Specification:
homodimer; alpha/beta; Quinone Oxidoreductase, Chain A, domain 1; Rossmann fold; 2 domains; 10 helices; globular; phosphoprotein (chain A); Synaptic vesicle membrane protein VAT-1 homolog-like (chain A)
Chain lengths: ~300, ~325
């Protein structure tokens, strides 16, 4: 009949969040219904909360884009799933709730070894990382990568994936308060460096990843994620990346599934592993967001739907 | 020995600033070799050098040209791997339009016996540009689609041939309609330059293409597509697109990537030997006829490369 959900009453600060009961959605054709066990907290959720969003959706709204759980009901015309299957999923909002309906093309079966909390930490960070390194840039042996915010979710995803390719040097920057916790992830770590990087690699780096130029080698790539004659003259590449838009506006679910299958292969070979920081109740969402604002987390924050506060 | 003949650019300006003259034969420094030139490539950049559109411009008088082929006539001190009589093609930082050229050995490549001197002078600029754009800037793979502007030009034809080495690649070309009968078999679909091909492409592929190659001489891109220009950042984020610029000469002579380029040339030569690629030569010109050849490139009248052939009588 009804479910519990986190509701953003309107745009503003933390105190616009509510926990309310609402109608359980039912799966339309080509959707399935997920009994949610965990939800990913992403930086973009803080932006949605303030209304710093392109074409902001109407409030009130249930936030969240990433979740894991158990298939509880099938929509018409769904291939490949049975109720009781364990899955992770993307969803265009509405993830922060006990039940979620989403089109099947955004749903991925998870291995038995993968817990729900890990699974809800898996898709946003690792797909973003994988797509930037191997689909936007073409990371190969011997290259070097500069990763800003090396301690963040995507930063850590990038560092693990780089280690699957031989002889890749990863340069990270981060809050100097974070260095002891993240130092073992990267080859060289800096305290927020151009000179310091140049001292190890005179020409700079092959790939720079920068979240919401002069550091690039020739043929290098700068990628921004969530003067054209200069590019010609300097032989450089600039790119932008928004996983949500790729999914929900541009129709590339099929491609992303390819990426998720490769990510799951790597996970099964024990070459990558999402790092969950802490598990938070639905009542504790304000506190979790605050912790992300205060940059106090080492790993991913995860909402545990069945946790009591 | 005696002085050699060369094309000199007297000063920047129009065609009439180009003349033939005699010059001191250069000798090879350490790590250089000396090449007896048989043919030279004409490139669009040569027209720009002629007007002084190059920031920052070299001093005049000067001998133009960046691409040549010929016979190794002498070795400089540091050099191994070559013998006199070796047939080669080579990049050279100006000074190619002369009977003799000296250039650092990292810019020289041995050519196969099957390859004529005119083909060889047609080979490096166009085919290395094509290769680097498709496989180093973009990462062309099976099933993708490419839009090539000026499909009849040297680079354009090199791009079509290289796409055909990768399975199931759909190549869209634009070109003037009088060229269409001669180049139609080199691409999958060919469109009129001055029509509105955007619609014509979209009618075959609603989403557009994976790679757009646009010369110095956006709305078309699929998600994750790459637009490359060769010789608003929140929009890129929102639309998931890639923009690149490419200048082979800068890569060679300013940025130090001779090693990489040699890798590309070795793979290009492997393809040539397997008969998968072959330079398309538009016309051969005498050294005296350089003005008329430049005019033809300006008038976009060529299909493939224009070559200055040193032993051709005017």
């Amino acid at each position: 009949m009804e479910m519990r959900a986190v509701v953003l009453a309107g745009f503003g600060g933390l105190n616009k969040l509510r926990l309310f009961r609402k109608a359980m959605p039912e799966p339309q054709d080509g959707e399935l219904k997920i009994r949610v066990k965990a939800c990913g907290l992403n930086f973009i959720d803080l932006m949605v909360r303030q209304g710093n969003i392109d074409n902001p959706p109407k409030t009130p709204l249930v936030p969240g884009f990433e979740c894991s759980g158990i298939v509880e009901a099938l929509g018409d015309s769904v291939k490949g799933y049975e109720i009781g299957d364990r899955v992770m999923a993307f969803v265009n909002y509405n993830a922060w709730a006990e039940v979620v309906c989403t089109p099947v093309e955004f749903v991925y079966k998870i291995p038995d070894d993968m817990s729900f909390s890990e699974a809800a930490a898996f898709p946003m960070n690792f797909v973003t990382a994988y797509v930037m390194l191997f689909e936007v840039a073409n990371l190969r042996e011997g290259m070097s990568v500069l990763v800003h915010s090396a301690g963040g979710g995507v930063g850590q995803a990038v560092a693990q994936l780089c280690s699957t390719v031989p002889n890749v040097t990863v340069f990270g920057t981060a809050s100097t308060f974070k260095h002891e916790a993240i130092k073992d992830s990267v080859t060289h770590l800096f305290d927020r460096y151009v000179q310091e990087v140049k001292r190890i690699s005179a020409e700079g780096v092959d790939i720079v990843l920068d979240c919401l130029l002069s550091l690039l080698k020739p043929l290098g790539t700068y990628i921004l994620y969530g003067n054209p004659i200069k590019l010609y003259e300097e032989n450089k590449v600039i790119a932008g990346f928004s996983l949500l838009n790729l999914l929900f506006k541009q129709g590339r679910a099929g491609l992303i599934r390819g990426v998720v299958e490769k990510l799951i292969g790597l996970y099964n070979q024990k070459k990558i592993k999402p790092v969950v920081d802490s598990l938070w109740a639905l009542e504790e969402v304000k506190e979790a967001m605050q912790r992300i604002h205060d940059r106090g987390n080492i790993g991913k924050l995860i909402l545990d739907v069945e946790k009591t506060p």
